[PDB]
From a paper:
Men or mice with homozygous serine/threonine kinase 33 (STK33) mutations are sterile owing to defective sperm morphology and motility. STK33 is specifically required in male germ cells for spermatid differentiation, and Stk33 knockout male mice are sterile secondary to teratozoospermia and sperm immotility. STK33 is therefore considered a viable target with minimal safety concerns for contraception in men. To chemically evaluate STK33 for male contraception with STK33-specific inhibitors, we screened our multibillion-compound collection of DNA-encoded chemical libraries, uncovered potent STK33-specific inhibitors, determined the STK33 kinase domain structure bound with a truncated hit CDD-2211, and generated an optimized hit CDD-2807 that demonstrates nanomolar cellular potency (half-maximal inhibitory concentration = 9.2 nanomolar) and favorable metabolic stability.
There is a lack of available structures for STK33, which makes determining the molecular basis for our high-affinity STK33 inhibitors difficult. The STK33/CDD-2211 cocrystal contains one dimer per asymmetric unit, with each monomer showing clear density for bound CDD-2211. All residues in the construct are ordered except for a segment of the activation loop (residues 273 to 283 in chain A and 274 to 284 in chain B). As seen in other kinases with the exchanged activation segment conformation, the STK33 KD dimer is formed by the activation loop segment and the following two-turn helix with the APE motif from one monomer docking onto a surface formed between αE and αG helices of the other monomer. The biphenyl (BB3) binds to the outer lip of the active site near the hinge. It interacts with L122 and G123 on top and G198, E199, and M245 at the bottom through van der Waals interactions. The indazole (BB2) binds the ribose pocket and forms hydrogen bonds with backbones of E193 and C195 at the hinge region. The pyrrolidine with dimethyl amine (BB1) contacts the Mg2+ positioning loop, glycine-rich loop, and activation loop. The dimethyl amine forms a hydrogen bond with D265 that normally interacts with Mg2+. BB1 is shielded by F127 at the Gly-rich loop (top) and E242 and N243 at the catalytic loop (bottom), and it interacts with these residues through van der Waals interactions.
Residue numbers in the entry:
A (entry chain B): 99 to 273, 285 to 383
B (entry chain A): 100 to 272, 286 to 382
The structure:
Amino acid sequence: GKVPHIRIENGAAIEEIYTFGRILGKGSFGIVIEATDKETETKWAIKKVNKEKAGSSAVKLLEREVNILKSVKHEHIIHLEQVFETPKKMYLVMELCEDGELKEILDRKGHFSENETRWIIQSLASAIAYLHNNDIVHRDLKLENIMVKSSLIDDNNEINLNIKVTDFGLAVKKQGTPIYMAPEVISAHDYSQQCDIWSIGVVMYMLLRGEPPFLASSEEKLFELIRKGELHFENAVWNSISDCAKSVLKQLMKVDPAHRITAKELLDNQWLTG
Amino acid sequence: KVPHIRIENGAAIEEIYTFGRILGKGSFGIVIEATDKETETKWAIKKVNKEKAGSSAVKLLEREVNILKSVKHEHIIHLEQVFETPKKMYLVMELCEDGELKEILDRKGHFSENETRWIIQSLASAIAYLHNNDIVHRDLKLENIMVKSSLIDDNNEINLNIKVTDFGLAVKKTPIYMAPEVISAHDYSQQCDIWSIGVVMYMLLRGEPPFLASSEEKLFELIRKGELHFENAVWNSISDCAKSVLKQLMKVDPAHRITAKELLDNQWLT
Ligand SMILES: CN(C)[C@@H]1CCN(C(=O)c2ccc3[nH]nc(C#Cc4ccccc4-c4ccccc4)c3c2)C1
Ligand SMILES: CN(C)[C@@H]1CCN(C(=O)c2ccc3[nH]nc(C#Cc4ccccc4-c4ccccc4)c3c2)C1
């Protein structure tokens, strides 16, 4: 159905339901603690955001994030169980991803196999296609968002990652006189969703290589690499990676969003199927 | 700066001004002619009913007022006063007796090359002012360019003292994951005003928009291709310099589209 938005008056009201545990992350987003349902003994993750620390700006952001998490339902988009709201704090009860962020796993593993990247990108492709079909653009897809809920080494000694997309604070839902409108305005309005595709292309590069596709010593020097967008292969690791994977890479990071592949086209690509 | 005077009711502002005929009406509210009883000066007052519009539409007018307060330019509309009753908001602005430029163009048909140069020169100065102060209009069109006075010169050519209005849509403008079109949008957000100048100049010379179609999708395809057709009979009398600046103001890529400061320095305006 729909997510309950329970309005309570202090932390003890929500502590009647859940046992609060250790802290899993902290930043400008608030803090995320482990929690255990006293009734069902199920493990959850509770994101506490202090409404009084962050002004009306970050609170209006948090309200759209909650509104988007309420309406989405997908196997690889984080599940919002309930929302509790005191006058001071706001609590987001979500499914627990015990294995942490994908960025931490990549840094400890080095890089991933082509099949392991294939599975992760397929999950990303399905979730991003779901969001785009519902007029939702993530706008901030990166390895620090992709949570991992469970792991599985199969018989091929290849790891299967059950990933979960999080952080919808920057997300937006899609919707002047036309004779006066400029081409880049038409492109930005008609291709407002293609930034998620670029992010999928970037994360696929980092899973295969272990380094970002563009890196520099200054911000601008980095921006210039992005505009050129020259995907550099010839590296020592690419020949054992199929040509079919490099074609979909080139399709995911077309500099022009006009010919950048779409989410639905991605799902139909032979590299994710066969 | 402009004081934001909070008053009680409509009779209170009618103590200051004598209200006259209505000059415009729409979703933006209504614009009346008004005369200061004390000073005898005529102004244009935009009355906005804070419930007839709405909260989404009231915040628009709040940013327009904040932008009109900080700008000062001989071809940007002057905001004299802002009065606020609990039910309405009043913007006292300098009166442009001659109305909108779109109405003048439709009645006249098209303009001479010198008449267009005077209009575009004023536009170029005003848009260069805004860009130099990091402000983008984003909605420049013939329906915005107000005309305060007209003057026929010795050559039987009209001199238009224009005023830019409607700033409601104006803006005061992890990296490794960022997409190219976002960098392009963040770096070239101001060039749309330049494209609007090119459109306005084409319509003043030609009398028709540079891109027109029977459907929106066909219209967008024309715009993204950006093909400038100078084949009509009135282009034969238009100098090559005017067509060159037209092609520069309507470069499809905003990266290669001429800037406001470069426009002011172009040979056609000098
Ligand atoms: C600012 N963004 C980058 C962060 C990314 C995650 N963010 C969350 O809000 C969030 C929402 C729902 C969640 N379900 N399970 C989560 C977890 C976890 C975890 C497990 C082991 C070790 C570390 C973490 C961890 C990592 C980063 C941040 C918090 C915890 C989880 C996290 C915002
Ligand atoms: C919705 N945009 C397209 C319209 C464009 C003008 N807009 C104004 O708000 C505004 C602000 C300050 C102003 N000073 N003098 C003005 C005038 C006038 C006038 C004179 C004769 C005949 C008609 C008009 C006229 C035309 C259109 C709208 C209102 C009045 C004036 C107008 C919004």
